[PDB]
Every structure is written in structure tokens, then in C-alpha cells.
């Protein structure tokens, strides 16, 4: 597995990056206080996840750059860059946790949550982002890709705060309205909030540090990556609730937030008249027992095993849109991933 | 007044930077709604204040660049500039608000107070903030200043960011500790979170539009801007408490808030160890009773009296300045930014 692989120099390269994102600020001692809470927040959310969208950067970035050109330097920048991308991932469920009222993430309590913390770790989150471009000034600025990798993160960035908005949108606090939860609007906002920055962003990222910029061979590898990406959000809201916690590190929220999950679409999809109400009844509320009778009419609709299927033809989807569009690109670069998150 | 002079066509500017945020995703309708609340959420955030900071970029921008270089697209490109700060300015005080649990802004309820907001309103106010990259896109790409823009629009975030960060530390909530809040601790927080953004920022921005991107220009600019923000700081923090609401359009929180406030700072200048115990047991609490026990304490100082002395030494000391600094740009640059702000 070339992640595990690649895994344990990445993560080396983490306090490396922590440094030089203190060390960057010496000549100033008046921040000095500022700098440590900084460094607070790289440790305590940006350590302790899978690391698969930044190691996604360094894996493409080894089978896209001819192995004459990954001398030292330009490896130092694709560990870099993949760090750039955990940093974007860092902000985004730092704010994210806050908004979806979550309790814990990567098995320890959500920052916003530590006492002493609460809505601090707004500016916190935002800290985080700014750090991306940040480094992307410090080791790559001279680069010839150096611009299009400033663009790629902050249109990543905007495409998923627009998928973040159509979330929020369609999931309103105290309002049941399940008429919403259609899969045609469930693709919309899967696209935009996580498909993009998960899947697009660090493989676009790795073909603008191998110097592939062409608009075609993006739009190529996006076909791919996009698809990829909806099946890891359907995933992630399939685990939401039927996860085991101690390994997805973190504990389900999406019925009590009335979100437009992928389990109360293909729910609508099935239930009975009696069945909707139950739902109607149910949905969108803090109630443990109500949530349970949602969980309980998921498992007597199969969803669990809907699931199970839906992987299934969404894996040979996903190898057969590989067939179709990885040319010229190695297919070993979407297969490496598929396998990760599959 | 140059200022009241470029107003009104800075501000009729505004609905055509919201049709073109809009206009610009009409080819992607399943973000409709999402676009409909960006829309939304520009309205609220971005409309009302007094827009000293984008009109600062406007008013520079034609006393920079040579009257025959200002054609059509040229204003059209210093008026989306001047936005752009705006934008900035709605993405912090949307947050800011939030962090610093205010009630009212620009004579309106602070937008995550509305009824069905909240916590929604992290998201908004990033989707404010990539608003400024979208537009820097659309109308700059093609100048020669472009990366310096986007460059300088990071870094102003960069250093406001860490400047809150300070702002938030040295004002721990339930925490009295008065032995943080010095002069010295207050000038860093001040320069950071605020006077880059608000002086250093428009104007350097005007600078690279006209050309003017040496490092001792910008370096002798700065040291104006950073004194003249410093300033701007002082009064925003004497108008929390002593100004009149239905002209600064807010209601202050700073005591409530334990805010380590030029007041403050100035009180235990000159406090009795009588006096400080006072300042002891009421700041830094929610209770409308010890707020006023502590705006009693400020008036038993004279501080509104030494605030109106500091005033003249500080517009005298910035005046100095500016006969020091402002070659080889024209001085009214400055002079009329002191004049709005003094
Ligand atoms: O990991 P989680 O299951 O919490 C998922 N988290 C997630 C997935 N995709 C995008 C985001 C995201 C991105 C930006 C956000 O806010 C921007 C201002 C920060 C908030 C959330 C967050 P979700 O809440 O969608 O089920
Ligand atoms: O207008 P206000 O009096 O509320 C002032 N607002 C203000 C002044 N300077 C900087 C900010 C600011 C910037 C960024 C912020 O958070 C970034 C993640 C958004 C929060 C606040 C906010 P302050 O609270 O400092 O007295
Ligand atoms: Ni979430
Ligand atoms: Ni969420
Ligand atoms: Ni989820
Ligand atoms: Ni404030
Ligand atoms: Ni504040
Ligand atoms: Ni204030």
C-alpha cells in the first residue's frame, strides 16, 4: 500500500512544519503569544486523522514527476503541499464541529468544546487556513506552479463554503421538512462541500507540481475524483450513524441536525405512508429516543444493506470512469486512492 | 471632502460586485440557493458602515495613478478593489461579533443574532471572505499586480487573524487577571488585528494598482498607516463605552467582554490600589451593575478628558509623520484619510 508507505515521512514532516510556521515569526516576539495558541491549534487538529488527502498530494506527486525531478527540495514541497491540504481539512471541521454541534473528533474531544475554548475557535479555524498560504509563500513562490496552486486552494475553498451553505440550507434547526431531501439536491451539496476539496484539490494539486496544467486533463481527472467523492460522502453519512465510534473517531449528529444525509433520502425513497410519518415525527430533534426510532425504521428499511450494494456498483462505477478517463495520468494515482477509501 | 466626492459611485458600484458573484454560477443552478444566501448575506454584511476602508482605495487610486491612465476599466477595477476590502471588513466584524457576543452593528441586529442565523453565520462570513478572491479573479487576473493583491489580501488576513488571536488571549472569559492589560501588550494587539488591515492595507493596495510596488515605499507608507490605525484603535475602544450608540451604531461589550481596552490600560495607570480593587471585582462581568461601576471609575479618572488630550498629540504626532514619510507620494493621500478618521 503506497499511503502506509509514504505515511511516516509525511507525518515526520509535521513538526517541521510546525516550526517553520513558528520560526517564520521570531523576528517578531510580540506575537509570541499568538504563535503559541497557533501551535496549540496545529497540534490539536491537524494530528491524529487518516492523513489520506495530503498523503493523496505526495502519492500523485511521486507517480506524476519523472523520478529524476523529485530531488530533495521538490519533495519537501509535496510533503508541504500535502500539509496544506490536512491544514484546509483542519479548518474546515474545526468550524464545521461548531456548526454541526459535534462532540468529539479523532477520538478526543472537539476543540470548540475544551474548556476555555467555546467560539475562539473561530478565529482559531481561520488561523489554520491562513497557514496554508502561508506555506505555499515560504516553499513555493518560486515555483512556476506557484499561482495556480494559490487559485486551486481558494477555489477550492469557495466551492466547498458554497456546498457548506447548501448543507446548512437544506438542513434548517427546529424545521422538519423532509420534502427537501431529495437525491438530486443530496448530489448538489455532496459535490460542492466535500468532493472537490477531498478528492479534486489534492490530486489537481499534485498535476500542477508535475507541471500537467492543461484544462482537459483536469477536467479528465475531476470526472474521476468528483465521483469518487460523493461515494466518500455517502460513506460518511452512512457511518454517521452505523459507524463503529471507536473507529470513526467521532460520534454521529446528522438526525439530530435534520440533515439532507444519504440514509434519510434513501429512506424517503422507501418508507410506507405510516413509515414517513415516523420520520416526520422523529427527524431533526435532540430526543436520544427519537433518534433511535429513526435508526430503528433505517434498519427496518435495510439501509445497512442498500449500502452494501451501493458500494458495490459505485466501486465498478468508479473503476470504469477510470477506464474512461485516467489516460494520460497513471491509473495507479486513482487506483491507489480507490483502494483507500473503498 | 474626496471622500463624500467618490461615495456615490463606490456605492451604486455595490449591486453590480453582487450581480457578477451572482451571475457568475447561473451556468451551475443547483447552487441557486446557496447563491441566494451569499446574496443575502453580502446585503446584510456589506452595506451600512461608513466604507472609509474601500473608499480609502478609490480616493488613492486617483491620486496615484495619472489622470490619464484612469479609464473606464481601470476605476471599475479600483472600485471592485475597494470592495474587496469591504468584504474583508464584513468577513471579521461577522465573526468578531459572534466572539465578542455583541447585540447591534451598523444600527441593526448583528447577523448572527437574526432568528434562524446563529451559528450558520461562521459559514457566511467565510463565504464572505472567498468572495474577495472570486472578485481579485474576475477583474484582475490579467494585470500585472495580481498576485501582489491576492498576496497582500493573505497577508492583511494573516496578521489580523494573529492580532485577534492576541485580542482573545489577553481577555480570557471568567478570568480577571488586570497585570496583562499594559500599554505594550495593548499596542501589538492593536497594530495586528486592527491597523494593517484598516490603513496598511487599502492604501498598499492602491500602491500596487498604480505601480508603486518598491519595499521602501511600502516600507514608509506603513509607518504612517500603523500609527494612524493604532489611533483608529484608541477611539473605536473611547466610543465603546462613552460614544453614542445611534451614531456608532453598536453597543459596546468591551468591559463585559474583560477586553484589554486602551481604557483599561489607561484606568491602572492611574488607579489608587483603592481603585483597582473596584476595577477588580466589576470588570470582565456580565452585570449591568459593575459595568457601571466601572464606567464610574473611568469618568472619576477624567479619562474621557485625557482620550480628547491624546487625540491632539496623537493627530499632531501623525501629521509629523506624514511630513517624514509621505515623499515621494502626494500627502493629501494621507491627510485625507487623517481628516475622516480624526
Ligand atoms: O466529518 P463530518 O461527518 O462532520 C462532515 N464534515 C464536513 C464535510 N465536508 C465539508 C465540511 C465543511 C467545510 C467548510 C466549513 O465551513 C467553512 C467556513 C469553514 C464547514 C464544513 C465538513 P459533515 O458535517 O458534512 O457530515
Ligand atoms: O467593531 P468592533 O468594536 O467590534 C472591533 N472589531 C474588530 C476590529 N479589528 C479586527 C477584528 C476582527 C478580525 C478578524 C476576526 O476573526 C477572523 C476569523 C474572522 C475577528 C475580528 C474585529 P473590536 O471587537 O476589536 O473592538
Ligand atoms: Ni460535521
Ligand atoms: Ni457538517
Ligand atoms: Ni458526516
Ligand atoms: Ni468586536
Ligand atoms: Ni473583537
Ligand atoms: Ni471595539
Known amino acids: 500500500d503506497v499511503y502506509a508507505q509514504e505515511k511516516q515521512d509525511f507525518v515526520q514532516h509535521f513538526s517541521q512544519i510546525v516550526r517553520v510556521l513558528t520560526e517564520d ?16 491549534v496545529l497540534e490539536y487538529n491537524a494530528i491524529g486523522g487518516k492523513y489520506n488527502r495530503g498523503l493523496t498530494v505526495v502519492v500523485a506527486f511521486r507517480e506524476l514527476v519523472e523520478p529524476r525531478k523529485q530531488d530533495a527540495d521538490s519533495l519537501q514541497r509535496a510533503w508541504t503541499v500535502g500539509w496544506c491540504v490536512e491544514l484546509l481539512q483542519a479548518f474546515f471541521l474545526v468550524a464545521d464541529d461548531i456548526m454541526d454541534s459535534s462532540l468529539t473528533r479523532r477520538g478526543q474531544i472537539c476543540w470548540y468544546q475544551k474548556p476555555g475554548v467555546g467560539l475562539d475557535a473561530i478565529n482559531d479555524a481561520n488561523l489554520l487556513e491562513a497557514c496554508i498560504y502561508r506555506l505555499l509563500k515560504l516553499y513555493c513562490r518560486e515555483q512556476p506552479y506557484y499561482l495556480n496552486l494559490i487559485e486551486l486552494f481558494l477555489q477550492s475553498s469557495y466551492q466547498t463554503e458554497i456546498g457548506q451553505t447548501l448543507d446548512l440550507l437544506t438542513a434548517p434547526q427546529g424545521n422538519v421538512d423532509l420534502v427537501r431531501f431529495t437525491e438530486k439536491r443530496y448530489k448538489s451539496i455532496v459535490k460542492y462541500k466535500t468532493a472537490f476539496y477531498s478528492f479534486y484539490l489534492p490530486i489537481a494539486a499534485a498535476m500542477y507540481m508535475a507541471g500537467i496544467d492543461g484544462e482537459k486533463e483536469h477536467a ?3 470526472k474521476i475524483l468528483l465521483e469518487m467523492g460523493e461515494f466518500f460522502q455517502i460513506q460518511d453519512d452512512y457511518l454517521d450513524l452505523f459507524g463503529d ?3 470513526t473517531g467521532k ?7 435534520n440533515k439532507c444525509s444519504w440514509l434519510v433520502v434513501q429512506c424517503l425513497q422507501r418508507a410506507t405512508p405510516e413509515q414517513y410519518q415516523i420520520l416526520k415525527e422523529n427527524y431533526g430533534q435532540k430526543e436520544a429516543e427519537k433518534v433511535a426510532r429513526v435508526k430503528a425504521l433505517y434498519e427496518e428499511l435495510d439501509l445497512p444493506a442498500v449500502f452494501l450494494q451501493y458500494e458495490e456498483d459505485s466501486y465498478s462505477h468508479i473503476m470504469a470512469l477510470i477506464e474512461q478517463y485516467a489516460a494520460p495520468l497513471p491509473p495507479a494515482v ?7 477509501i473503498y
Open 25 to 40: 515569526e521570531m523576528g517578531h516576539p510580540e506575537i509570541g503569544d499568538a504563535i503559541a495558541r497557533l501551535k496549540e
Open 220 to 222: 479528465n481527472a475531476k
Open 245 to 247: 465510534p471507536s473507529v
Open 251 to 257: 460520534i454521529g449528529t446528522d438526525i439530530q441536525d
Open 334 to 340: 486513482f487506483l491507489g486512492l480507490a483502494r483507500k
